[PDB]
A and B are shown apart, each in its own frame.
Chain A
Amino acid sequence: DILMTQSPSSMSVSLGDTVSITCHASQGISSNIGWLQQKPGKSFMGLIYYGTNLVDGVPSRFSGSGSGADYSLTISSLDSEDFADYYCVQYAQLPYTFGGGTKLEIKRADAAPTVSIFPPSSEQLTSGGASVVCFLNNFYPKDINVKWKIDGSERQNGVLNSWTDQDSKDSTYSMSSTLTLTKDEYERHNSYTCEATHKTSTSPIVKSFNRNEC
């Protein structure tokens, strides 16, 4: 099968920019390549067929070029509706195969996360379970690491993370981290901490609380 390596996996760019997504194929495919767009939570639209040909309806700020095994999609003067996912597909051979895609995201100013921690609820405890939650809100860039500690010691089992898509009107990202324990195990310890590591600070932002005590 033909491997399509697509780069870059993502890029944080601005309106008006001219950007290029490349695609390298494991062998020559003589312009038998298509480019595709998927807007957030939507289906796909075709942009380019056979290397350089605009699909009907596509604005001409989109162009495709390349030959042999190396191809590019270029978007001149980025529009707000261009922040989306893009994929290449080769049809030189069966089976058809796809690139790993590229997500255009909005560039903005760095912003440290607002970190917030919640002990389990009374209701949850009486049913025998215990979830501690940390919210890491409105930060940029998207790369961020969360670490749980119980009585000062890292904890990894029982953690479930969820991330939002770039927020429409402030271009930040958020994340939610939940640590789930049995009520019985939650009571064996006193300290609960979540530490956020972001490019904005060399030191982790730390939030804690002690069980019982308050």
Chain B
Amino acid sequence: LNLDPVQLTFYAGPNGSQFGFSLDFHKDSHGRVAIVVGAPRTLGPSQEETGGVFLCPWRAEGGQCPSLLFDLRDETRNVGSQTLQTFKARQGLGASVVSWSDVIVACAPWQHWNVLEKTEEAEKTPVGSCFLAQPESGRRAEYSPCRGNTLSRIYVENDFSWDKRYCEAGFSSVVTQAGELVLGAPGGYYFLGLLAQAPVADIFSSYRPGILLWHVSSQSLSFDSSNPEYFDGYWGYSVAVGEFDGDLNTTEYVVGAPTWSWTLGAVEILDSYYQRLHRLRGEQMASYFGHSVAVTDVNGDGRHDLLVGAPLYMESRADRKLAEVGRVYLFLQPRGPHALGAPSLLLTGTQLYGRFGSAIAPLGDLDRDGYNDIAVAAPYGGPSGRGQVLVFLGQSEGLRSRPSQVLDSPFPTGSAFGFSLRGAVDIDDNGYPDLIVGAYGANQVAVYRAQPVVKAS
């Protein structure tokens, strides 16, 4: 309703860098809010794309941001009669970024890895990797849970079980309130997908430069499966956390698997041991149900609700025609131990190929009426196809079914405005939470400041 679309603030990265591809708010140890921005095609040392991360101080006028530096050099370690190799070219550092406390985690899902041993090898594959920074102290660490030292032939002889070579760890990421980093790795176990978790504190304390293969003992990884419903499900394409079993001591995980079951799609809610508590199935094959997930209580009863995006959903129209517009599903969490039901609300796109539901951001309570609200992106939506973000307000029965406000992309065609979104943080400290919108195709980020409601609704 009350985001201000007149005086925006723009931040900008290098041309071609895809600055804005991912972003998050970051609070320093004194609570000053900044914006961390991933730019997964930023040029590295060999004038080769490797990705990069920027840490943008808040300023109404926006502008350029300093880099948050990470080591971009390929590494080699000859040890235990093997050769370990990391390959950073085109790794897409900054394809995901998240902030927790005063730490920043930025991931490179396509970082490759190989292990040589005489004439054999593991195979050079994208295991992905994450880079952790504490900007104030300069501390750095890394976490790459799918690196292995097993040779190719061993996987063949063992029928490709527990094969974490194509994980793409860091493809998605999230951090629990207690500080457990949770990485989605949709290539995990031969393209089933897996999750990897470890406390941030333990990642820092167990990491040293140059080791390349090291143990994080408190880490926990999900499981392989022989069930074909999971094959090529990309479980972990998106991830989130929240409270779904009534017990405030345990954190539950929400995992999108947009091609689960021969592309039907699914989203699963799991306990922290990866035991499945509920499964939501997509409605339509190939709609990419689970591309995005969001967790927030929208109807003010204190219980977290789940939103799921299916950006390629095809709506039925006149004369047995189908129109690809995208759809968002709202599931309200019921009182006490009970299955999430059918969806409480379906929000459906209007613009052909607009991809409504491609991203969904909790806004906290934008208009301050006591119900949390959300922003849904349609990166190619709007009447001109340039991208729109739509705001939906919470209320006692769930969400309003018509947007209270629509933000049309201020960028040119192709910017993919809305592809990343983050809300619920008050960046200018005026008592209203604000919204940041990435437009990686234009290498920019737009900040929308929430302002006092003009007339309430």
B interface residues (Cβ-Cβ under 8 A, vs A): 77-81, 208, 210-211
Contacts and interface: CB of A to CB of B under 8 A. Distances in A.
B208 A94 contact: no
A32 B82 CA distance: 12
Nearest to A93: B81
Given A92-B79, A94-B80, 18 more contacts: A30-B77, A30-B78, A30-B79, A31-B210, A32-B78, A32-B79, A50-B208, A50-B210, A50-B211, A53-B208, A91-B79, A91-B80, A92-B78, A92-B80, A92-B81, A93-B80, A93-B81, A94-B81
Contacts of A53: 208
Nearest to B79: A32
A30 B80 CA distance: 12
B219 to A, nearest CB: 17
A92 B77 CA distance: 9
A65 B182 CA distance: 36
Interface string A16-47: 00000000000000111000000000000000
Contacts, number: 20
Nearest to B205: A56
A211 B210 CA distance: 72
Interface string A134-153: 00000000000000000000
B120 to A, nearest CB: 15
Nearest to B208: A53
A60 to B, nearest CB: 15
A93 B80 CA distance: 5
15 contacts: A30-B77, A30-B78, A30-B79, A31-B210, A32-B79, A50-B208, A50-B211, A91-B79, A92-B79, A92-B80, A92-B81, A93-B80, A93-B81, A94-B80, A94-B81
- Which of B78, B79, B210 counts the most A-chain CB atoms under 10 A from its CB? B79
B246 to A, nearest CB: 38
A29 to B, nearest CB: 9
A94 B81 CA distance: 6
Contacts of B211: 50
A94 to B, nearest CB: 5
A95 to B, nearest CB: 9
Contacts of B208: 50, 53
A92 B81 CA distance: 6
A129 B80 CA distance: 56
A186 B81 CA distance: 60
Contacts of B210: 31, 50
A93 B82 CA distance: 8
A128 B172 CA distance: 86
A91 B81 CA distance: 8
A129 B211 CA distance: 63
Contacts of A94: 80-81
A50 to B, nearest CB: 6
